[PDB]
Amino acid sequence: YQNAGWRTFFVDNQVKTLISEALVNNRDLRMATLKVQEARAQYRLTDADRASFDLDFFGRLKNMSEAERQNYLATEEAQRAVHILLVSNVAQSYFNQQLAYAQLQIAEETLRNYQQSYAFVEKQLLTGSSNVLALEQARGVIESTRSDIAKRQGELAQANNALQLLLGSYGKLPQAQTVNSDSLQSVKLPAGLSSQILLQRPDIMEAEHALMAANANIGAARAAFFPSISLTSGISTASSDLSSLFNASSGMWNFIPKIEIPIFNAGRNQANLDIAEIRQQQSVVNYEQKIQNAFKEVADALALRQSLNDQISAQQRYLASLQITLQRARALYQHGAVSYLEVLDAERSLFATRQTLLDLNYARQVNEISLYTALGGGHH
């Protein structure tokens, strides 16, 4: 029933449709791993033809023997790992697709704009107005634009490929969903998000498994080593509790554990005492390292998110002024007040700002996925 994590995390209805479809089409965990691998593979196809999470997971897996890959991957953390891996790749592939639809759209609008600007010139050039080298270079920008269009068309096909793979044979690939530029800031996160949520991370579940294996009292380990705080403030920002866990201007981790109740027994003393202890030490040191990194990941994502939100906000502002400036330029033109070329030039500034905004929105999306992943599967 872990559907609660992605259903309440991802806001976009289309992407939730796709995620739901892929889960249905990927009942077998080992197969889901193949499909993700291959969906990832045919992007690297752009290099060899002429996310930290997936790296670690796939890296972990191949460094394993086949018997081990099968023992693991029957454990709970591995199914959680594969759920998250699947969800995040479907969502990423969709954003890649929608990104490409959108860049392609702008690129074609830019082309038409360059062709109008060009056609205009050559009528005037035959009345003595421009350089032949100007006319020359206007031809070049059109040809390079034609280039990007085919390039964007390839990126579109790459992502559609990845999508069909994750989705299976009977999955409807989305049309271009048109973008309203005034709704691109990310969505609010629940306030006072409890750090307990991080216990659902595969890497921390695996760490607690290693603790239980060295016979730790898990309750006692958590109380000793796991900061029980809130992750978010009243807004969707890092809480002060979260921030204070890192030294100012060093990022060094602050938490100093105190063990009130012994985590390991004296156990079954007799023989191999020292070795059992070493394993106890190791599972603990590993628990610690995973925790501080989990918390660092969440903090880094929250910070990246606030930064991209501010950048997007600024681009939206430039865009609104460029839109109003274009309309005014169009009216002036109609009154003989400005040349046609000034109108096209203004439109081009709109186009470039739209493209920047698209890039940032996408980087925001990549970061949401990061957050979803750093939370260990959403915030429920």
Q: How far apart are CA 293 and CA 52, in angstroms?
A: 12
Collapsing DSSP to helix, strand or coil, 238 comes out as strand
Mark the breaks in the chain: residue after which each occurs, C to N over 2.5 Å.
50
Please name the amino acid found at residue 261: I
Resolution, expressed in angstroms to one decimal: 2.5
Answer whether 289's CB lies under 8 Å from 316's CB.
Answer: no
DSSP output for 277-322: HHHHHHHHHHHHHHHHHHHHHHHHHHHHHHHHHHHHHHHHHHHHHH
Q: Provide the residue range defining the domain that includes 94.
A: 1-380
- Map tokens 């973008």 to a residue: 179
Q: What does the alpha-carbon distance between residue 222 and residue 287 come to, in Å, rounded to a whole number? A: 9
* Inter-residue contact 22 to 82 (CB < 8 Å): no
253: domain CATH number? 1.20.1600.10
Nearest to 359 by CA among 311, 307, 318: 311
Q: Which residues of 163-183 are buried (b: 16+ CB within 10 A; e: fewer)?
A: bbbbbeeebeebeeeebebee
How far apart are alpha carbons 234 and 8 in whole angstroms?
A: 19
Length of the chain: 380
For residue 230, what are the β-bridge partners? Answer: 194
**Total number of domains in the chain:** 1
DSSP letters for 165-228: HHH-TTPPPPPPPPP-TTS-SPPPPPTT-BGGGGGGSHHHHHHHHHHHHTTB-HHHHHHHHS--
Q: Experimental method used, please?
A: X-ray
Contact 23, 86 (CB under 8 A): yes
Phi, psi (degrees; rounded to nearest 5) at 241:
-50, -50
Q: What is the 3-state secondary structure (H, E, C) of 91-157?
A: HHHHHHHHHHHHHHHHHHHHHHHHHHHHHHHHHHHCCCCCCHHHHHHHHHHHHHHHHHHHHHHHHHH
Distance (Å, rounded) from C-alpha 205 to C-alpha 212?
10
197: number of CA atoms within 13 Å, CB side?
Answer: 24
DSSP 45: G
